[PDB]
Amino acid sequence: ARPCIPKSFGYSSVVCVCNATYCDSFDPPTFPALGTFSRYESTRSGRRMELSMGPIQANHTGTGLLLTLQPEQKFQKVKGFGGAMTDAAALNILALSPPAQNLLLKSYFSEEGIGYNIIRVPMASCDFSIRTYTYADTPDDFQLHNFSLPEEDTKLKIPLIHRALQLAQRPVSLLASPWTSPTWLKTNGAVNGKGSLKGQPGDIYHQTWARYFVKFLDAYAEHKLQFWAVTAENEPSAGLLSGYPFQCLGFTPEHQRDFIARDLGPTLANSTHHNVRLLMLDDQRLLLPHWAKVVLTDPEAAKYVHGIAVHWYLDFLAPAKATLGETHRLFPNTMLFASEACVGSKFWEQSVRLGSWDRGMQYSHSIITNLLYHVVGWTDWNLALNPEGGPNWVRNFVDSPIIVDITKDTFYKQPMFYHLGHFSKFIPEGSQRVGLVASQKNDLDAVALMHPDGSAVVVVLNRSSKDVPLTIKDPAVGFLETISPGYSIHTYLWRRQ
Ligand SMILES: *[C@@H]1O[C@H](CO)[C@@H](O[C@@H]2O[C@H](CO)[C@@H](O)[C@H](O)[C@H]2NC(C)=O)[C@H](O)[C@H]1NC(C)=O
Ligand SMILES: Cc1cccc(C)c1OC[C@H](C)N
Ligand SMILES: [K+]
Ligand SMILES: [K+]
């Protein structure tokens, strides 16, 4: 129904302004009739997921560029898209007025929004927190009698999480990850700094750390929230670095391997939560394939790991083929999942850039590259941040698809938000990536998938300044003549007979 209200802040494109009385929204989703394709277009010049429709044609002639769908060439099935309800997300969101708060959650979780079906929940406090705490701060409580949830959980996250679920018609999957244990389980006795669990997998400390995961799920189950999956540790390599500035817990791969095999997996297997999946790694892609090689070649650990979670810092370059591609090759049955993405992490960089097309382009290119290397899911970091990229208790600010302006009761939908929605809205859970062949060398980036119901979705990204005319062929159905303007992203949808 409602278009974008664009404001500029002096970066390359615009944000969409939402408040207590107005937000950009889509109508209830329909597909076009057979013979007709839908095209959603966003541009640096200002367009924001503007729907257009075109005929699907029987013949095509040209020398021009041709993308030909390979609908019977099938890759991964997609789990979904989401972001993280961190403390700071929660705080930003609840600092808005009920109406603005509600249009923000609509924005992400509703079919008038961009159809998120994943929420990552930090287990207690991380850097995007204002207190340091765990659920079990009383020292030497090995049986976790004094384990409990504080208000960060019971008043901010859990209520917002239930609200996001009410708005979504898609089933929504929660993912948990802890940053640190209680300090009294750690070699260095602090939430941060170099250090890991004391003792050895199998022992009291390790069994207590694994019983903490069960208490965590037990406690969220009291509030009627079930988890789809947990990671074994957020960025386990962080806790191995001297000076590490915020909450962390260090594992070598050998250590994570043993802890999964002897403690966490078994502990989880013998709880009511045996159906929660366990994801390993939950760190940067350059740790692959070596980490998977260490963990998944051990059969006692291997039988507990459902997938491998990877982190993307889009500020930084790293190979995709030699890491994700190699890991898929060695371990094709284990799924790959992107649990965290973020832009603007570099201290020297403006944390929040209101209107950056470039950072939107970065989000899309990453999702595409992820999809091309067999990853089944992509999860953004903080759902909402302030205009500083906070709050963050060690001043570790970063960008977010949504920026809250509490003083004006306003929030701003960045280009990022739309780049991500070009995927999240139009690829439901159980979609399968299919193949896509380009007839010639070209500057586009593209991905094609098939809906559970057999409908086609292709997203095309133009990072170049030039308007590339092109054609998409569906062998069964016909041709789509179109164009990919410089600095644009499009998503195409159609029914297949
Ligand atoms: C929320 O934002 C909308 C859009 O910016 C505001 O409505 C606009 O108000 C200005 C000034 O009266 C007019 O130029 C426009 O005609 C209005 N646009 C629309 C779409 O109604 C609205 O006043 C803002 N609300 C609050 C509470 O701040
Ligand atoms: C747009 C496109 C679609 C399918 C296959 C290829 C290789 C392709 O080009 C990617 C290349 C980076 N420009
Ligand atoms: K407690
Ligand atoms: K920064």
Q: Rounded to whole angstroms, how far apart are CA atoms 452 and 474?
A: 17
Backbone φ and ψ of 276, nearest 5°: -65, 130
What is the per-residue DSSP string for 17-49? EE-SS---BPPSP-PPPTTEEEEEEEETTS--S
User: Which residues are catalytically annotated?
Assistant: 235, 340
Query: Measuring CA to CA, which residue among 34, 32, 40, 159 is closest to residue 101?
Result: 159
Separation CA 162–CA 9 (nearest Å) = 34
The residues pairing with 51 across neighbouring beta strands, listed in sequence order, are 40
Technique used by the depositors: X-ray
Domain covering 79-424 in this structure, CATH number = 3.20.20.80
Under 8 Å between Cβ of 185 and 213: no
Q: Which ligand approaches the C-alpha of residue 343 most closely?
A: 4
Q: How far is it, in rounded angstroms, from Cα 141 to Cα 138?
A: 6
What ligand 2 atom has the least distance to the C-alpha of 442? 13
- CATH architecture assigned to 57-76+432-494: Sandwich (2.60)
CA 301/CA 256 separation, integer angstroms: 9
- H-helix or E-strand containing 282? strand 277-284
Tokens of 62: 């040209």
Tokens of 166: 């009410």
Q: Does 65 contact ligand 2 (Cβ within 6 A)?
A: no
Q: Which residues line the pocket of ligand 1, CB cutoff 6 A?
A: 5, 17, 19-22
Which residues, other chains included, contact 418 with Cβ-Cβ below 8 Å and sequence gap of 6+?
42, 48, 49, 360, 489
Strands 432-438 and 444-450: antiparallel
Cβ neighbours for 347, distance < 8 A, ≥ 6 positions apart: none
Q: What is the Cα–Cα distance from 416 to 363, expressed in whole angstroms? A: 6
Report whether 331 contacts 281 (CB < 8 A). no
CA–centroid distance, 470 to ligand 2, in Å, is: 12
Do 451 and 494 contact (CB within 8 A), yes or no?
A: no
Classify residue 117 by its DSSP letter: -
**223, two tokens:** 């509030």
Q: Is the dihedral of CA 69, 74, 79, 81 positive or negative?
A: negative
Domain ranges of the chain: 57-76+432-494, 79-424
Closest Cα to residue 484, out of 12, 14, 41, 53?
A: 41
Which are the contacts of 151, defined by CB distance < 8 A and separation ≥ 6?
none
Helix locations, 187-286, DSSP H? 204-222, 253-259, 265-269
Instruction: Name the DSSP class of 430.
Output: T
Ligand 2 and 66: CB distance under 6 A:
no
> Which uninterrupted H or E stretch holds 151?
helix 151-151
Distance 15 CA to ligand 4 centre (A): 19
Question: Given the CA of residue 436, which atom of ligand 2 is nearest to it?
Answer: 4
Strand partners, 402: 413
Candidate of 17, 22, 25, 96 to mutate for ligand 1, largest count of ligand atoms within 8 Å of Cβ: 22
Instruction: Give the number of other Cβ atoms within 10 Å of residue 286's Cβ.
Output: 14
Report helix, strand or coil for 97.
Answer: coil
Asked whether 444 lines ligand 2 (CB < 6 A), one says: yes
* The one-letter amino acid at 9: F
Helices (H), 307-434: 326-330, 357-372, 415-424
Any atom of ligand 2 within 6 Å of the Cβ of 67: yes
Which of 434, 444, 462 to mutate for ligand 2's pocket (most ligand atoms within 8 Å of CB)? 444
Q: How far apart are the first and last CA of the chain?
A: 30
Count of C-beta atoms within a 10 Å radius of residue 169: 12
- Looking at this protein, which amino acid is placed at residue 55? P
User: Best substitution site from 4, 14, 19, 103 to test ligand 1's pocket, by max atoms within 8 Å of Cβ?
Assistant: 19
User: How many CA atoms are closer than 13 Å to the CA of 64, on its beta-carbon side?
Assistant: 16
- Atom 12, ligand 2: residue with shortest CA distance: 445
SS3 content of the chain, % helix, strand, coil (to 5): 25, 30, 45
Which DSSP category does 240 fall into? G
Whole-number Å distance, alpha carbon 187 to ligand 3 midpoint, is 21
CA 437 centroid distance within chain: 27
Q: Do the Cβ atoms of 359 and 416 come closer than 8 Å?
A: yes
Q: Copy the structure tokens of residue 392.
A: 């963050």
> If you compute the radius of gyration of the chain from its CA atoms, what whole number of angstroms results?
23
41: Cβ below 6 Å to ligand 2?
A: no
Taking alpha carbons only, the member of 58, 19, 56 closest to residue 36 is: 56
Tokens representing 466 are 């030039």
Kindly give the residue spans of alpha helices, DSSP state H, lying in 336-430.
Answer: 357-372, 415-424
Q: Which residues of 115-128 are buried (b: 16+ CB within 10 A; e: fewer)?
A: bbbbbbbbbbbbbb
Ligand nearest to the CA of 345: 4
Ligand nearest to the CA of residue 445, numbered in listed order: 2
Q: Which residues 6+ apart lie within 8 Å of 42 measured at CB?
A: 48, 49, 50, 360, 415, 418, 419, 422, 488, 489, 490
Q: Which ligand is nearest to the CA of 346?
A: 4
Identify the DSSP state of 2: B
| Beta-sheet strand order (sheet of 15-18) | 6-7, 15-18, 410-413, 402-405
Nearest to 384 by CA among 357, 417, 359: 417
Give the CA-trace dihedral at 90, 135, 212, 156, to 10 degrees. -20
Query: How far is the C-alpha of 341 from the C-alpha of 380, rounded, in Å?
Result: 5
H-run or E-run covering 469: strand 468-474
Among 128, 263, 217, 123, CA closest to 179: 123
